Amino acid sequence: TKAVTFYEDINYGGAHVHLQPGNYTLSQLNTAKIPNDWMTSLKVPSGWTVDVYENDNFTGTKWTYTSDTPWVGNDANDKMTSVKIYS
Ligand code: NI
């Protein structure tokens, strides 16, 4: 099973969580054990797209990742509140 992996810390450190494609609100992230304001790095399967949103329900600033990322950027860091994952 291919999945996006979200990591708590820089360079894929700390706690991590795997998620299949989908559109996850903040509550859904928390249910899958991803707290708010937590994600710092992520791995993305080849050909996939991850749209990280600053606020809930897929709003606010949107950062897009299409490959493995040891650091999501200073603005994006610990700001993920909702996210859309595409294969
Ligand atoms: Ni794992």
Side-chain angles (χ1 to χ4, degrees), residues 49-72:
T49 304
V50 182
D51 284 332
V52 174
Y53 294 83
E54 172 186 48
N55 302 104
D56 204 353
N57 301 120
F58 319 113
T59 61
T61 298
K62 186 179 84 191
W63 304 280
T64 305
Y65 307 92
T66 55
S67 64
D68 298 350
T69 305
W71 169 256
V72 291

Side-chain angles (χ1 to χ4, degrees), residues 3-46:
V4 171
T5 312
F6 300 93
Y7 295 87
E8 178 185 20
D9 291 328
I10 193 164
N11 205 33
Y12 318 118
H16 71 278
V17 172
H18 311 277
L19 283 176
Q20 288 300 291
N23 308 331
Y24 305 83
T25 72
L26 177 59
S27 51
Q28 286 156 2
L29 289 176
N30 296 165
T31 292
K33 305 158 183 194
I34 294 167
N36 200 359
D37 294 343
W38 169 98
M39 198 273 296
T40 297
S41 56
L42 76 156
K43 288 178 186 183
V44 185
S46 169

